[PDB]
Amino acid sequence: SAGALESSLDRKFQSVTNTMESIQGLSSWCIENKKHHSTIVYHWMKWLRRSAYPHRLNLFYLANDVIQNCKRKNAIIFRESFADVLPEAAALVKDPSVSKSVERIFKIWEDRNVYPEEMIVALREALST
């Protein structure tokens, strides 16, 4: 019954499109949903297979923005739940036509040290070969 409340996340994530108008607005509000950061990754992930190649690339930006909206490494715990399927989600973007753009967010996580290299090995498996 109460589990229907989680649909407040999945219906809005499915409504997202390739624009900062939809990304920055929902990623800012998603930080107030930190009370369920464990399931938010499950909603956003299953929309990648639903979406087109350029569209699922845009949905992948949401995860990167939500990690960085929690910000300042004060806890940044959103990164830990995204790490559960971070490479598995990248398996939906093996096409070099999109892998080149998903490397944009993975490049930032690598330079911003948002993840240990041991995790990035799975990111580069899923984006490269």
Partner: peptide
């Protein structure tokens, strides 16, 4: 529908 730049948000 301006698409954003991943480095724009701070961390």
């Amino acid at each position: 529908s301006p698409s954003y730049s991943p480095t724009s948000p701070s961390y």
